[PDB]
């Protein structure tokens, strides 16, 4: 979807905890640069719950969308405190944005 939309959704719902720029600093959440194509729990010098590491999934736009719908259902024990995006557009709009922002 729309990547201008995804952008505000990210600034509004993910930004408090995460950066996307390269080198970007971890916050509550890991720096999300080069997320896609990496395995869950790999960002460097960020401490992940064993749960995020032991799930080891490659982040592809697809498993990523199941995740955002409900982070605790996906990776129980995860400590990311997000309720989830219940709206497909939102998910589209965001992912698309991310796709592009985390290059």
């Amino acid at each position: 979807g729309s990547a201008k939309k995804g952008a505000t959704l990210f600034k509004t719902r993910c930004l408090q905890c995460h950066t996307v720029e390269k080198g970007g600093p971890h916050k509550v959440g890991p720096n999300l640069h080069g997320i896609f194509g990496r395995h869950s729990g790999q960002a460097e010098g960020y401490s992940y719950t064993d749960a995020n590491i032991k799930k080891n999934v490659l982040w592809d736009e697809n498993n990523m969308s199941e995740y955002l719908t409900n982070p605790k259902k996906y990776i129980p024990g995860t400590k990311m405190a997000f309720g989830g995006l219940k709206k497909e557009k939102d998910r589209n709009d965001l992912i698309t944005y991310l796709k592009k922002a985390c290059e």
Binding site: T8, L9, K11, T12, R13, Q16, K27, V28, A81, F82
Partner: protein, 294 residues
């Protein structure tokens, strides 16, 4: 004469199901207008409205409290410690037009119950029967707490609501939700990172962050952590009181516990001052949108 007696009266032949419908409306709309406040949603504000309409109670003469839905009168509506709740009032006027039978008092509280459950908090038994009361029952402004105080003002402000130390520490975990808005109250910032999902972040932040006191732009002082959060005086005071501090540690350690004390307290908060005849229905447990396929 003794205090006033407020008997809960069920709305003429309504029942759970009639009330699960109201929830659904509220619940959905929280799903729909999700852009509010930089995408925090209407969650935090509805739980804050729930608290404010109930927090005027005075156990000595039993005035104030949720019963009367008096927040709808200007006097109350305009109380300066009520700034920002108009946003919560508007969000439910629509839904009220949809269900004009439910009383104001039953709507403002059901609303906070929905928001907690909808944000993944614990289940909160709830009861109906609040009845609307004349403009004359409107509590004078000033029965709600100040932020700029310490453990001891807190302990005492709460004996008036009839709450103990554990109930006061549990209630405060609600500070995991939303943030402070300088235009509303002189303070600014969020307590944490997941402002719209209900956890015990409030307590881990309190004890794991590094707080420094500082002045905001409104010219008030607050505690800021390097991480971008803030704590009000009254929140910080929870770790400076030896007694508040061990409840805070319990909770940072065990969410279930927090989840259980909070639900017990929040509901106690919402039912204060109300007498339920022995014929009223057992408190209701509503289902979430998730539990209903949504």
């Amino acid at each position: 004469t003794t205090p006033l007696v407020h008997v809960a009266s069920v709305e003429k032949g309504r029942s759970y199901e009639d009330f699960q419908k109201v929830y659904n409306a509220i619940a959905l709309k929280l799903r729909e207008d999700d852009e509010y406040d930089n995408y925090i949603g209407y969650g935090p504000v509805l739980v804050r409205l729930a608290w404010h309409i109930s927090g005027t109670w005075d156990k000595h003469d039993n005035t104030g409290g949720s019963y009367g839905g008096t927040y709808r009168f200007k006097k109350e509506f305009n109380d300066p410690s009520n700034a920002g709740l108009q946003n919560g009032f508007k969000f439910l006027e629509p839904i009220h037009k949809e269900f004009p039978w439910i009383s104001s008092g039953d709507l403002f509280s059901l609303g906070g119950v929905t928001a907690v459950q909808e944000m993944q908090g614990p289940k909160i038994p709830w009861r109906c029967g609040r009845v609307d009361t004349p403009e004359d029952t409107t509590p004078d402004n000033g029965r709600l707490p100040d932020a700029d105080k310490d453990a001891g003002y807190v302990r005492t402000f709460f004996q008036r609501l009839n709450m103990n130390d554990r109930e006061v520490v549990a209630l405060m975990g609600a500070h995991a939700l939303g943030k402070t808005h300088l235009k509303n109250s002189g303070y600014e910032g969020p307590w944490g990172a997941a402002n719209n999902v209900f956890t015990n972040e409030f307590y881990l932040n309190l004890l794991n962050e590094d707080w420094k006191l500082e002045k905001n732009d409104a010219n008030n002082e607050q505690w800021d952590s390097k991480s971008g959060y803030m704590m009000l005086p009254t929140d910080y005071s929870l770790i400076q009181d030896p007694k508040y501090l061990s409840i805070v540690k319990e909770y940072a350690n065990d969410q279930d516990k927090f989840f259980k004390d909070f639900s017990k307290a929040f509901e106690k908060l919402l039912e204060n001052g109300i007498t339920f005849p022995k014929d009223a229905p057992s408190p209701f447990i509503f289902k979430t949108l998730e539990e209903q396929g949504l």
